[PDB]
Amino acid sequence: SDLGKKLLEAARAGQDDEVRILMANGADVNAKDEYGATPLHLAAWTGHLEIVEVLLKTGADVNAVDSVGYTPLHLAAAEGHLEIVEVLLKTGADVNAQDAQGITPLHLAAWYGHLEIVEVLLKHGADVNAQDKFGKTPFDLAIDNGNEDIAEVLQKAAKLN
Amino acid sequence: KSIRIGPGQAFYAXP
Ligand SMILES: [Ca+2]
Ligand SMILES: [Ca+2]
Ligand code: NA
Ligand code: NA
C-alpha cells in the first residue's frame, strides 16, 4: 500500500532497520515500482546484503521478474555482488532465468567482467552455453567485451559438461 | 552497451 512505496525506497537506500520496521508493520514484500522491481530486486541491484537476507526471510519471491524479465539474480550478477549472488542461489534463485531478450545471469556476469560470479553460477548449474535472442553465449559476450579470462573459464566448463 | 543496467533497462539497447 502506502507502505510498499516506503519499503521500495528503504530497500533501494539500504535502510536495513527501516525495512525490518515496515515488514513488521505489514508492508507488501512483493510491492513493485513503476518498472516492476520488488524491494528484493532493488536491494540485490544496490548490494544491500543484509536487506536481501531480511527480505528472503520475510517471504520475498526470489524469482520475481521486472518489466523486462530481470530477476534479482540478474541484477546482482551484473553489478558483481558476490555474497548476494550466493545467498540468492542458496534460497532458490533460478540460476538459468532468461529475461525478455534471452539474457541469463551468466551472460551478464561474463559481459560485465565478474569472474568470481561466473564461477559461482557454473557451480550452481548455470547453462554454460545459454543463447540470447542474438544466438550469443556467455563466452561470445566475454570475448566481445575483452574478458578473455572469463572466456577460458567458460570453454573449460563446456568441454567437461 | 550501458556501463550499468538496472530494473526495466534491457541489456541490448543500442550502445
Ligand atoms: Ca544491521
Ligand atoms: Ca545448454
Ligand atoms: Na549461437
Ligand atoms: Na582482456
Side-chain angles (χ1 to χ4, degrees):
Chain A
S1 223
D2 43 347
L3 285 199
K5 183 190 263 79
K6 274 164 218 281
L7 185 54
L8 293 153
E9 280 167 18
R12 186 203 268 265
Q15 296 322 286
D16 47 302
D17 290 339
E18 184 59 19
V19 173
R20 288 185 175 88
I21 290 167
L22 291 156
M23 288 309 305
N25 279 343
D28 185 355
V29 74
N30 299 305
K32 294 170 170 272
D33 73 5
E34 52 193 349
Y35 287 109
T38 66
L40 184 63
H41 286 96
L42 296 180
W45 181 40
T46 63
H48 295 315
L49 173 71
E50 210 177 329
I51 297 182
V52 167
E53 293 179 292
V54 171
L55 293 162
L56 285 169
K57 287 286 156 165
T58 74
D61 171 10
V62 69
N63 287 328
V65 297
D66 78 355
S67 64
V68 305
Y70 289 143
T71 64
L73 176 59
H74 278 97
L75 300 176
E79 295 286 331
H81 298 310
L82 174 66
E83 292 169 82
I84 290 164
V85 165
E86 298 250 43
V87 192
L88 290 170
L89 288 169
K90 296 217 188 72
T91 328
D94 179 349
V95 72
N96 285 322
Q98 56 173 354
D99 67 14
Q101 302 181 326
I103 283 282
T104 69
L106 189 61
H107 279 106
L108 288 169
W111 177 274
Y112 284 106
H114 303 311
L115 183 143
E116 268 213 280
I117 297 316
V118 164
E119 289 176 321
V120 169
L121 287 174
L122 293 165
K123 172 167 198 268
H124 278 91
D127 183 3
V128 63
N129 55 22
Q131 295 186 63
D132 61 27
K133 62 178 280 169
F134 296 110
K136 297 272 194 165
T137 59
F139 174 90
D140 298 325
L141 290 191
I143 287 303
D144 290 344
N145 202 31
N147 295 319
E148 290 92 354
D149 55 356
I150 297 178
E152 288 186 79
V153 167
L154 293 155
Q155 48 158 38
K156 282 172 289 171
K159 199 200 208 71
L160 307 169
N161 269 301
Chain B
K1 288 282 194 306
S2 45
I3 284 169
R4 299 289 182 269
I5 52 108
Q9 183 180 359
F11 176 76
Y12 291 112

PDB file of all heavy atoms in Angstrom, chain A residues 13-25:
ATOM      1  N   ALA A  13      17.703   2.379  -0.694  1.00  0.00           N
ATOM      2  CA  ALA A  13      18.626   3.287   0.030  1.00  0.00           C
ATOM      3  C   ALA A  13      19.433   2.569   1.115  1.00  0.00           C
ATOM      4  O   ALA A  13      20.290   3.260   1.762  1.00  0.00           O
ATOM      5  CB  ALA A  13      17.858   4.417   0.646  1.00  0.00           C
ATOM      6  N   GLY A  14      19.186   1.282   1.347  1.00  0.00           N
ATOM      7  CA  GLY A  14      19.991   0.493   2.304  1.00  0.00           C
ATOM      8  C   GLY A  14      19.653   0.823   3.755  1.00  0.00           C
ATOM      9  O   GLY A  14      20.560   0.728   4.627  1.00  0.00           O
ATOM     10  N   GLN A  15      18.405   1.209   4.026  1.00  0.00           N
ATOM     11  CA  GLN A  15      17.925   1.482   5.412  1.00  0.00           C
ATOM     12  C   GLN A  15      17.452   0.139   5.988  1.00  0.00           C
ATOM     13  O   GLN A  15      16.250  -0.127   5.915  1.00  0.00           O
ATOM     14  CB  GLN A  15      16.884   2.617   5.424  1.00  0.00           C
ATOM     15  CG  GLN A  15      17.427   3.986   4.971  1.00  0.00           C
ATOM     16  CD  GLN A  15      18.834   4.308   5.434  1.00  0.00           C
ATOM     17  OE1 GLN A  15      19.084   4.617   6.597  1.00  0.00           O
ATOM     18  NE2 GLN A  15      19.802   4.226   4.528  1.00  0.00           N
ATOM     19  N   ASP A  16      18.376  -0.715   6.476  1.00  0.00           N
ATOM     20  CA  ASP A  16      18.021  -2.124   6.793  1.00  0.00           C
ATOM     21  C   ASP A  16      17.031  -2.193   7.958  1.00  0.00           C
ATOM     22  O   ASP A  16      16.127  -3.020   7.879  1.00  0.00           O
ATOM     23  CB  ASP A  16      19.199  -3.043   7.076  1.00  0.00           C
ATOM     24  CG  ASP A  16      20.199  -2.447   8.026  1.00  0.00           C
ATOM     25  OD1 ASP A  16      20.711  -1.348   7.696  1.00  0.00           O
ATOM     26  OD2 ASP A  16      20.404  -3.050   9.113  1.00  0.00           O
ATOM     27  N   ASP A  17      17.182  -1.384   8.992  1.00  0.00           N
ATOM     28  CA  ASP A  17      16.272  -1.459  10.171  1.00  0.00           C
ATOM     29  C   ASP A  17      14.914  -0.846   9.806  1.00  0.00           C
ATOM     30  O   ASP A  17      13.893  -1.317  10.324  1.00  0.00           O
ATOM     31  CB  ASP A  17      16.939  -0.803  11.366  1.00  0.00           C
ATOM     32  CG  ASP A  17      18.121  -1.610  11.892  1.00  0.00           C
ATOM     33  OD1 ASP A  17      18.177  -2.825  11.605  1.00  0.00           O
ATOM     34  OD2 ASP A  17      18.964  -1.012  12.545  1.00  0.00           O
ATOM     35  N   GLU A  18      14.875   0.134   8.896  1.00  0.00           N
ATOM     36  CA  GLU A  18      13.585   0.696   8.380  1.00  0.00           C
ATOM     37  C   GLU A  18      12.850  -0.384   7.572  1.00  0.00           C
ATOM     38  O   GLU A  18      11.643  -0.539   7.748  1.00  0.00           O
ATOM     39  CB  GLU A  18      13.821   1.961   7.563  1.00  0.00           C
ATOM     40  CG  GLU A  18      12.546   2.623   7.109  1.00  0.00           C
ATOM     41  CD  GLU A  18      11.594   3.038   8.219  1.00  0.00           C
ATOM     42  OE1 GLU A  18      12.027   3.162   9.435  1.00  0.00           O
ATOM     43  OE2 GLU A  18      10.413   3.232   7.867  1.00  0.00           O
ATOM     44  N   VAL A  19      13.564  -1.169   6.772  1.00  0.00           N
ATOM     45  CA  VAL A  19      12.989  -2.357   6.093  1.00  0.00           C
ATOM     46  C   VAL A  19      12.383  -3.285   7.157  1.00  0.00           C
ATOM     47  O   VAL A  19      11.208  -3.717   6.985  1.00  0.00           O
ATOM     48  CB  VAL A  19      14.022  -3.069   5.192  1.00  0.00           C
ATOM     49  CG1 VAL A  19      13.481  -4.376   4.629  1.00  0.00           C
ATOM     50  CG2 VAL A  19      14.513  -2.145   4.080  1.00  0.00           C
ATOM     51  N   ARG A  20      13.118  -3.580   8.224  1.00  0.00           N
ATOM     52  CA  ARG A  20      12.622  -4.520   9.241  1.00  0.00           C
ATOM     53  C   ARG A  20      11.343  -3.949   9.864  1.00  0.00           C
ATOM     54  O   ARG A  20      10.397  -4.736  10.057  1.00  0.00           O
ATOM     55  CB  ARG A  20      13.714  -4.796  10.274  1.00  0.00           C
ATOM     56  CG  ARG A  20      14.855  -5.661   9.756  1.00  0.00           C
ATOM     57  CD  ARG A  20      15.794  -5.962  10.919  1.00  0.00           C
ATOM     58  NE  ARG A  20      16.867  -6.862  10.586  1.00  0.00           N
ATOM     59  CZ  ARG A  20      18.035  -6.484  10.097  1.00  0.00           C
ATOM     60  NH1 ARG A  20      18.308  -5.208   9.869  1.00  0.00           N
ATOM     61  NH2 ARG A  20      18.946  -7.396   9.808  1.00  0.00           N
ATOM     62  N   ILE A  21      11.325  -2.644  10.183  1.00  0.00           N
ATOM     63  CA  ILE A  21      10.164  -1.925  10.799  1.00  0.00           C
ATOM     64  C   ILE A  21       8.951  -1.990   9.836  1.00  0.00           C
ATOM     65  O   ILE A  21       7.841  -2.415  10.249  1.00  0.00           O
ATOM     66  CB  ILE A  21      10.591  -0.496  11.252  1.00  0.00           C
ATOM     67  CG1 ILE A  21      11.538  -0.574  12.460  1.00  0.00           C
ATOM     68  CG2 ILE A  21       9.399   0.409  11.564  1.00  0.00           C
ATOM     69  CD1 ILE A  21      12.264   0.707  12.815  1.00  0.00           C
ATOM     70  N   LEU A  22       9.114  -1.664   8.559  1.00  0.00           N
ATOM     71  CA  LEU A  22       7.964  -1.689   7.608  1.00  0.00           C
ATOM     72  C   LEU A  22       7.453  -3.113   7.413  1.00  0.00           C
ATOM     73  O   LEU A  22       6.226  -3.254   7.330  1.00  0.00           O
ATOM     74  CB  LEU A  22       8.442  -1.134   6.272  1.00  0.00           C
ATOM     75  CG  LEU A  22       8.740   0.351   6.320  1.00  0.00           C
ATOM     76  CD1 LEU A  22       9.727   0.709   5.225  1.00  0.00           C
ATOM     77  CD2 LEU A  22       7.444   1.135   6.187  1.00  0.00           C
ATOM     78  N   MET A  23       8.330  -4.123   7.373  1.00  0.00           N
ATOM     79  CA  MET A  23       7.878  -5.526   7.167  1.00  0.00           C
ATOM     80  C   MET A  23       7.015  -5.928   8.386  1.00  0.00           C
ATOM     81  O   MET A  23       6.032  -6.660   8.238  1.00  0.00           O
ATOM     82  CB  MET A  23       9.038  -6.518   7.035  1.00  0.00           C
ATOM     83  CG  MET A  23       9.847  -6.460   5.738  1.00  0.00           C
ATOM     84  SD  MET A  23       8.765  -6.524   4.283  1.00  0.00           S
ATOM     85  CE  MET A  23       7.830  -8.020   4.561  1.00  0.00           C
ATOM     86  N   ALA A  24       7.364  -5.498   9.598  1.00  0.00           N
ATOM     87  CA  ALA A  24       6.638  -5.988  10.787  1.00  0.00           C
ATOM     88  C   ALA A  24       5.311  -5.228  10.902  1.00  0.00           C
ATOM     89  O   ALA A  24       4.400  -5.695  11.599  1.00  0.00           O
ATOM     90  CB  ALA A  24       7.494  -5.824  11.998  1.00  0.00           C
ATOM     91  N   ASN A  25       5.216  -4.126  10.168  1.00  0.00           N
ATOM     92  CA  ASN A  25       4.050  -3.232  10.135  1.00  0.00           C
ATOM     93  C   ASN A  25       3.155  -3.598   8.951  1.00  0.00           C
ATOM     94  O   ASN A  25       2.170  -2.852   8.760  1.00  0.00           O
ATOM     95  CB  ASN A  25       4.512  -1.775  10.139  1.00  0.00           C
ATOM     96  CG  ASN A  25       4.866  -1.300  11.535  1.00  0.00           C
ATOM     97  OD1 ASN A  25       4.482  -1.931  12.529  1.00  0.00           O
ATOM     98  ND2 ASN A  25       5.598  -0.197  11.602  1.00  0.00           N
TER      99      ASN A  25
END
